A = this chain, B = another copy of it.
Amino acid sequence: SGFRKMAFPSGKVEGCMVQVTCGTTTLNGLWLDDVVYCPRHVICTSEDMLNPNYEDLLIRKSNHNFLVQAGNVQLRVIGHSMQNCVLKLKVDTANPKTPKYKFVRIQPGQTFSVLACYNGSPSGVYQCAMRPNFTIKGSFLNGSCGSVGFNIDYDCVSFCYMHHMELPTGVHAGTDLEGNFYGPFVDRQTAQAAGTDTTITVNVLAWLYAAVINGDRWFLNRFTTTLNDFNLVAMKYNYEPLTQDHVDILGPLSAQTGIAVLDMCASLKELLQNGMNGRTILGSALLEDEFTPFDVVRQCSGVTF
């Protein structure tokens, strides 16, 4: 028992992290087979970021201008190209620690682990969600660009995020591993703010099921609701609509607890309208929305990798 925010074991990703330097800019790259992936703004100075012409900056760089280091060992760059907002540096040595891997583009509301790195060295691991407004609420300092987000399924690492930018509100924006940003954001220091965010309803429900499984049951009320009536309330509290697909995804948690999804919705409705009255749920005094139904199942069933 117990329920914690839990990241995937990071070892398979740690063995892929390298340092990439171009001129006076250093950030992190991801070394898979003989290719290093990194944010293309490694070729920008601080002044370049205000309005960068990436094609024009890149044509002035040679392979030799890219210093790639794996620990204390330089990897020789033998080719380079730009794909959307990422650079791909071909190196003459394939990473001996390359895991089985895939590149995936995740959906808003899904979660992943971030291995925060500086100078190619891992510093910490944490879990976060792709917000409905396509930002993530990470923990990133200068030098963290190129840190990646991932999920693991037994032996296979699915890379879904590469860190590029901090917005003026302190939240974070980045790309998939094909270099396409999540959301409308661009890798330029300009006026681009996150749109209004929303709460991930299906995840709040998943976490309420986790609470019941762990014995935190005080919020269960005696009522039910229709899906349409629940969604009228959820709207007022800036919760995203609950779809029948979401109801279906919650089926296994409903089966385990015996609580029908629409019955749990009625209990959430009351929490939204009345508040928690100073009580806690799974040690939290607010409703948590960064655990997916699959995260709850994993942690409550002990899935390993």
CB of A118 closer than 8 Å to a CB of B: yes
CB of A100 closer than 8 Å to a CB of B: no
Within 8 A of B (CB), among A233-286: 280, 283-286
Neighbouring B residues of A305 by C-beta, 8 Å: 121-123
CB of A294 closer than 8 Å to a CB of B: no
CB of A124 closer than 8 Å to a CB of B: yes
Query: Contact at B115–A9, with CB atoms within 8 Å?
Result: yes
List the number of copies, as a whole number: 2
Q: How far is the CA of A299 from the CA of B118 in the complex (A)?
A: 12
Q: Mark A1-29, 1 if CB is under 8 A from B, else 0.
A: 11111111111101100000000000000
Q: Is the interface of A mostly helix, strand, loop or mixed?
A: loop
Q: How far is the CA of A8 from the CA of B284 in the complex (A)?
A: 23
Can you show 17 pairs from A to B with CB atoms below 8 A apart?
A1-B139, A2-B139, A4-B126, A5-B5, A6-B124, A6-B125, A6-B126, A7-B124, A7-B125, A10-B11, A10-B125, A11-B14, A11-B15, A118-B302, A122-B305, A123-B304, A170-B214
Residue numbers of A with Cβ under 8 A of B are 1-12, 14-15, 115-119, 121-126, 128, 137-144, 166, 170-172, 214-215, 280, 283-286, 298-305
Q: How far is the CA of A14 from the CA of B12 in the complex (A)?
A: 10
Neighbouring B residues of A8 by C-beta, 8 Å: 124-125
Query: Contact at A117–B10, with CB atoms within 8 Å?
Result: no
A7: contacting residue among B126, B138, B303, CB under 8 A:
B126
Neighbouring B residues of A144 by C-beta, 8 Å: 302
Query: Contact at B214–A125, with CB atoms within 8 Å?
Result: no
Query: Contact at B125–A125, with CB atoms within 8 Å?
Result: yes
A303 to B: closest C-beta gap in Å? 6
A49 to B: closest C-beta gap in Å? 17
Query: Contact at A137–B2, with CB atoms within 8 Å?
Result: yes
In the complex, the chain B residue whose C-beta lies closest to that of A144 is B302
Q: How far is the CA of A10 from the CA of B124 in the complex (A)?
A: 9
Neighbouring B residues of A14 by C-beta, 8 Å: 9, 11
Neighbouring B residues of A143 by C-beta, 8 Å: 302
Q: How far is the CA of A267 from the CA of B78 in the complex (A)?
A: 57
